[PDB]
Amino acid sequence: TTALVCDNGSGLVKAGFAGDDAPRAVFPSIVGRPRHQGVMVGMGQKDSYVGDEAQSKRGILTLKYPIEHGIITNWDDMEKIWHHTFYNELRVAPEEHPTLLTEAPLNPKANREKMTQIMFETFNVPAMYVAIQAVLSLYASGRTTGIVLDSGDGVTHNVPIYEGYALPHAIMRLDLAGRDLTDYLMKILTERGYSFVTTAEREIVRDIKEKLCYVALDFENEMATAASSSSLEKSYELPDGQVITIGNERFRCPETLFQPSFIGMESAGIHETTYNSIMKCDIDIRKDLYANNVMSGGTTMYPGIADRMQKEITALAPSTMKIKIIAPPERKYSVWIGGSILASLSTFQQMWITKQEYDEAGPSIVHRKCF
Amino acid sequence: TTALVCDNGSGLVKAGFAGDDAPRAVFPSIVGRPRHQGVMVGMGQKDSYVGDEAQSKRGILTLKYPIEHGIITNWDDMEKIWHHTFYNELRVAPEEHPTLLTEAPLNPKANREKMTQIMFETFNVPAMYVAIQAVLSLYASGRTTGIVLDSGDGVTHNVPIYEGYALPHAIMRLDLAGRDLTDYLMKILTERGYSFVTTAEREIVRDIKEKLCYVALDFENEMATAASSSSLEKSYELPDGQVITIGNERFRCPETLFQPSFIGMESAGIHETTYNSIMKCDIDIRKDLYANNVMSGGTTMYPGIADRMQKEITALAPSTMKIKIIAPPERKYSVWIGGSILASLSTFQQMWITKQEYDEAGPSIVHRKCF
Amino acid sequence: TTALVCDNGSGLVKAGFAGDDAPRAVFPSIVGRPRHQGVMVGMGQKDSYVGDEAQSKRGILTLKYPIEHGIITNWDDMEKIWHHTFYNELRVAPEEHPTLLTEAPLNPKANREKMTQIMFETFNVPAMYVAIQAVLSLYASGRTTGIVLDSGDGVTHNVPIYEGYALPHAIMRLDLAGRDLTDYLMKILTERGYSFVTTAEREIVRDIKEKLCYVALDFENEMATAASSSSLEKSYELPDGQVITIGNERFRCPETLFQPSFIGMESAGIHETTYNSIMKCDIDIRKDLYANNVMSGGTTMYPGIADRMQKEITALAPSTMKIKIIAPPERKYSVWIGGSILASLSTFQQMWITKQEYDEAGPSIVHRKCF
Amino acid sequence: TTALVCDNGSGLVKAGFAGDDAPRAVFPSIVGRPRHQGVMVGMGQKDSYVGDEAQSKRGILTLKYPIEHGIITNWDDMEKIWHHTFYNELRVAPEEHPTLLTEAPLNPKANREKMTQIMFETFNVPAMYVAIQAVLSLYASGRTTGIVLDSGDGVTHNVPIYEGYALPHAIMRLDLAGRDLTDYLMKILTERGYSFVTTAEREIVRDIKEKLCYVALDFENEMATAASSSSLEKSYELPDGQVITIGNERFRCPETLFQPSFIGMESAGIHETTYNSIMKCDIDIRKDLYANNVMSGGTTMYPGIADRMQKEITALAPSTMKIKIIAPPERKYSVWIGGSILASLSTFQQMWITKQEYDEAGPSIVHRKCF
Amino acid sequence: TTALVCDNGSGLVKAGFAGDDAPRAVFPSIVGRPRHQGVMVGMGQKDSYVGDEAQSKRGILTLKYPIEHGIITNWDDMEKIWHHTFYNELRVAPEEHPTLLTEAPLNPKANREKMTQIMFETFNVPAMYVAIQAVLSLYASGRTTGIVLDSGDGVTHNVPIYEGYALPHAIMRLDLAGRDLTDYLMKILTERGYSFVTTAEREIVRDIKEKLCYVALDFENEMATAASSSSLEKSYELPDGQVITIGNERFRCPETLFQPSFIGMESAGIHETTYNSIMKCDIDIRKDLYANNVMSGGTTMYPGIADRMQKEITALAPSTMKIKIIAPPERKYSVWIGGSILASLSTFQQMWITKQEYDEAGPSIVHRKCF
């Protein structure tokens, strides 16, 4: 009846209905299991906990993420998350509405084929479609031309779009994402003697990162300042009441996005990746892509990311070029919003894969580009 | 028919039926034998006396405790106690009801294996189960999360439980218990010239301890006060009418629980043991364990123990943490009560070791964790 | 057939049959011999006289007591007494009934071994047993707990018994007895010019003591009163019609029992001896022993002994203790009665030393404690 | 003059001079203090005992380890150990030779900064350097490529090295180490009724572990065998002459290294940790790392560890890959030996931090990577 | 000037000067008073007699011991003994030398406080110290490690010492001592008809014990032998020329030390007490304590005590343990000798309580442990 929109982002499930300006259900993409004992099956105990349950009880659970680098590998856990998304969070049977899913570009074909099989055989979804997140993000901004840099939990990717058309030969993908920034920070923090090694401890570091980190406009000068100025340090209170101090780690973590070599990657930084995607595009397109660099995704939340990227692109770009970073306060939900918008358009209504077409055509249909 | 509950606590047998809010049979875990002469077997004399008999006639008997540090070592005497518990105190044949027994954690495997053999071969018990006392105590409070400090006659132990799950790597056990506090007091009292050296005299000191001792909130200031203030002294009338005066011994005895070094132990005090058990638990669990420290067992009867423990944990705990000591007027019977509750639950009804399963499986079955 | 009971008390033989509530034969334990001439063996004259004969003819006989301080030393005279007890007084052959004898505690082993040899070799007694008098006295009262103070002619002794058991480490024995009280009075009376130096004269003093003496409740005040009040004096008529006056000697004689130093002893008085025996007993026993101090034996006949002992024990005892003196009108025969009772019990019937066991085991059997 | 090499390993100090093929001074990293009384300061008594003294007198001392999980926390005790290492064991003044120290990777920066301050301000060391143990261990083997698994007393760590270069993004660290294996065994042994709770008792368990434990090649089959076969049990004689029997505990203890969940950890087993470190390395490096897995450190002493690790890596590794475990009889001293070798090289002679450079540069110099 | 050493042992005063290898003054701790008459104060008569006077005139005196179970209760008599020790036996004014006193462990605090008050207020002693006898005895042997069993007249005690340190939690005290052995023998001897009931008679029994008793290596076999062999009997000549025969009483008396139940005690025998004190000590200490069991005190004079104790400890000890009894010919004076040694050491010279410190600090100073 109303298209259902579900962004199976790494680390976070965002879902709601088309026409809604926000997801209704927002919870971690986490499935947890008991760590220290078995399940008291003859008593009030469960085999697994999901999303908010997984977080509330995280101190006794081993937590797993079914999605790694944007690819679903743990299909059983992925179904558990969907099972709750549909029946406990949105509380809607799948048989009632068509569903729009999202995906990072350049994944295994199997990832689409398996999501499709599940949505038609485990959940009886009337029709479905799987969209690229960068495209939806641009729909959310309302522009037809620009380059979208979606930097999430598992994948960072750049998809230039011009006058509504994709420029696929220029799509670039990095493995570096929020999951790695968290892991890097866990390692950085051992320098101050704070050792976080368990899964729940990983979740704490993630929370620290989210509240304390920022992007230095000038890393070296910020670091030189940090070396002597105590004004850089901030305290953080841990769940058990202990208090720790975070210093230059507040900006050394996100710096990884500009310098991937910090974690051993040969990868381009986000400002080099963006630049190269633009350079792979036609000379008469480049002007507009520089003019409209569009940010989206949770890692773009670090304060100052917009200014640092403006500086870096400007430095790489021709001196007579106008460079602008577009970074609305709603970047975190850009994909979800784009989903809601697209799902409600009369043009999109013609692109759905119905169950009947799927059953007759088979899995190859998921690679259909109807438009 | 009705599960029978029997807490074979060191120094005291507490038994009754499931569904009863109190034990029906409460008597000392003591077997006595004549000290000065043989048994007039051709006349009205016995070889041994048990429980109340052992106490009423204690002046002519050598008394023994079959349980040391929570471990049954004198199996013949243990059977004599059970023989009376079933046939003279509760006056029920074992063949009529299933029986729930209790145990301290981390004992020899043999202790469970031997109790089981006796309950199926000497007493024909239809089915049985042996539970950990800390767990039962938490059932009695009705909470699912908290740390239970059971401090009895032979063992003091700490078992953290979270959301119904055990956290076994954090179980801590101390040897210090009520039996040692009594022995320490017997030694302290020689300072005033009161020498208690026989077994019956030990029982008198135990009675003195029970009526006069308290926990100083501040040991050093209480002691400094005691040094000059006569208001600290209390009289006690001995069974033969002689009267003695007890001074600072009233609080020096229980202080041992906070300072085990007084009796030569390297052991943590009860407030350090509790704290460390909490620190061995996951950071996202610790908050609730601090919030709910649950006391149980006879040594927690000393007036003021709740306030002294509150002070000590608070001092060790983070300053932003909420610490609360839970110490109901019924702590002495918490294990028994938990026994009654568990025994009546439909979940527990599935966990019993039946005689038939025992006979086929053998003794290894006692280590079964059905739940 | 019927056990024969014979109490070979110093100075007096009391014998009868088990089941009889009184001895049938009561006569002095005295053997006399002619003093002034030889025996007219060719005429109607005897070599010796026994018991009543010894008393009726005492003015011409030297009289001897075969028992000194409870120990038989003159075995030939002891046999003469037994010879008459069996054949002239009870008129029963020893071969017809088993015999129960009595003894003071802590005597030479030989005393039991010799009585046994005589009873199996001179008198053909089927079986025998030698009992402690304090024990029999307690049987006579019917109590199982109490301390018995048997004060007879040759020995005074204290045997605490608790719940039917002996407490042998607390048995105390004094040499002071009725024989000494008589000798002391003979010496006191020389003060009034009445000199009694022969054996028959000793018997007269014994008779005077028996009729005139009493225990002062308060010796010093009684003596101070006696110093000026003629109401204290009593007359006594001697066998030859002469009349003498006895004054404060009436209470100075029995006072010796409270003050043994009057006759040169280091010994405890009877109230100190009783007290110390109780103090040597376990603290949880002492309460009952104070509650039941049981008197027996001929020296307890002095009027007022019960009240004086009540005063003295009360003074030594704790102020919150209940002290009671048990002193029935039948104290003089308590041992004999206890003998009759024990002899008739089915438990006692198993404890007898038979002649056959004696002949095979030898004399060591007399120290058997069958019970 | 000659570089001094000192491996401040947790639980054991190994020191000697560069060029020496073995440490000269090997003693426990233990500082002990009197447990039952104060120090008789006016007599022949000490405040503390160190190393061998701490062990010889351990029955009266509380013993402490200044190093926990590879981190020095008790700096005063650490200086006492160094004080003896230099003046009593090696008997060399620090002013005479430069010193090479060792460290686990990923520690607090402060650990290096504090060791440096002590070595320049308390001990006047001419120059110093602090090396990573895994690196030294590889120098000891003589290889330039391989992965080193150093498993000691407080830390287990994996540092892949390729063609002389570190691959730091793949360094993995576990908390599980010999100290935990000992604690686990102390808990396992309560099953047989052997309770070790004091510090000296901990040292006994450590000795038991060292002589009796081995790694099962197949844990489940070894355990199933142990269940019925008495050939598994071994006796051990305790210091006081008592004898105890150890059964399957001989292999259940070291099994923890393959299954850390036995002690509540979420940690990878040693064979998973090694495997993952290799997988984090470049695909063209992995082949050599599989070929050369190098073991070092005291926990690798358990007999059979080499074969069990060979089995586990082989199972995880590709089937066409050659996997080899390198485990020389000298693994226990690999770090010390590597120290001696490096210290004598002409390349290393250029890397020393001199006192003068330290005084001018300050503590940040300890993080210098001169090479 | 020279420390004075005075061992106020129960029943015997041993005193001399530090540096002397023997006491100069050795006499009974006895105060006697006239028994049969008053004091002829207008003639050559005294109110009391002390020590040797008390013994020479014992037949007319009641003798008292001011010390019972190691505790001074008759303070007036204690001063009379000290009065003679200082002025008639050593003939030294107390004002001239500092004095070292001895004490049994675990006495009333008052015993030290009162001895101190007397030594500073009745006798003007410059300085004093009160030492534990077990400690001094070990000084006399010259060992620093061993367990000392001091068995004297009123108290038997066991104080383990390791490497010069006390292990106070393992101090054990028995009431059984030489005074009880004497009383038991007085009771045993009534079996042969020898009744000793006065105080002087007690002294005779003490002399008999000292010359005739021995410890059976094997009590039951010695007793079985004694039952038929006349070679066991020995004669003894009494002060009045009468001769008595002592048989198995020669070994039944000292047997009490191994079997305290003979006199009604629940107490451990001396070999059980020693064993338990060792078992209460740390496992790494026990080996040396078994190796060095040190005997001291007058009751260890019975011939054969060393061999019987060797047998008993060996039987209780582990079979691989080396057990040795140390029992020099000088055991009787070990405490005195240790006193002389300690008193002369430069370390001890710092531990004295001076009169000035006492006057300012008050009685609590007597519990000072300066060392």
Ligand SMILES: C/C1=C\CC[C@H](C)OC(=O)C[C@H](c2ccc(O)cc2)NC(=O)[C@@H](Cc2c[nH]c3ccccc23)N(C)C(=O)[C@H](CCCCN)NC(=O)[C@@H](C)C1
């Ligand atoms: C915030 C946080 C910890 C800090 C607690 C407190 C507020 O601060 C300190 O006290 C710092 C203080 C400090 C000590 C010394 C110094 O030279 C400089 C610093 N660190 C230590 O003791 C460290 C030591 C440690 C253990 N393995 C490590 C691995 C790498 C680095 C350090 C460690 N230790 C006990 C923890 O990290 C523990 C447990 C880790 C192992 C679990 N298997 N971890 C936590 O609780 C988590 C939530 C992290």
Ligand SMILES: Nc1ncnc2c1ncn2[C@@H]1O[C@H](COP(=O)(O)OP(=O)(O)O)[C@@H](O)[C@H]1O
């Ligand atoms: N303010 C913030 N700063 C840094 N990281 C953030 C912030 N907010 C969210 N994140 C990170 O973004 C990721 C989730 O955001 P999102 O892009 O929605 O993930 P996904 O699209 O994979 O669901 C997490 O890694 C989270 O820590």
Ligand SMILES: Nc1ncnc2c1ncn2[C@@H]1O[C@H](COP(=O)(O)OP(=O)(O)O)[C@@H](O)[C@H]1O
């Ligand atoms: N009010 C009290 N104060 C101190 N100790 C007490 C008190 N009441 C009981 N106890 C002690 O508690 C012990 C018995 O209590 P309990 O915990 O039930 O023992 P158990 O569980 O071993 O049977 C005894 O050591 C007893 O002296």
Ligand SMILES: Nc1ncnc2c1ncn2[C@@H]1O[C@H](COP(=O)(O)OP(=O)(O)O)[C@@H](O)[C@H]1O
């Ligand atoms: N009423 C009395 N007052 C004082 N003494 C008495 C009295 N009656 C008996 N006796 C004394 O008691 C002794 C005999 O009593 P008894 O106890 O039966 O002696 P035994 O038990 O030795 O045969 C004699 O010494 C006698 O004088």
Ligand SMILES: Nc1ncnc2c1ncn2[C@@H]1O[C@H](COP(=O)(O)OP(=O)(O)O)[C@@H](O)[C@H]1O
């Ligand atoms: N044969 C062995 N088996 C098991 N553990 C051992 C063995 N030898 C030594 N160990 C353990 O190794 C640790 C000390 O070795 P080492 O690696 O040198 O420690 P560190 O490097 O921390 O000084 C201790 O925990 C010790 O018990």
Ligand SMILES: Nc1ncnc2c1ncn2[C@@H]1O[C@H](COP(=O)(O)OP(=O)(O)O)[C@@H](O)[C@H]1O
């Ligand atoms: N050879 C011996 N055999 C048995 N007992 C002895 C011997 N010598 C002395 N005694 C006993 O030892 C006690 C006195 O010795 P001692 O230990 O010096 O006493 P104290 O230390 O109390 O002064 C007395 O009880 C005495 O009888």
Ligand SMILES: [Mg+2]
């Ligand atoms: Mg996303």
Ligand SMILES: [Mg+2]
């Ligand atoms: Mg209990």
Ligand SMILES: [Mg+2]
């Ligand atoms: Mg009588």
Ligand SMILES: [Mg+2]
């Ligand atoms: Mg190491």
Ligand SMILES: [Mg+2]
């Ligand atoms: Mg002595």
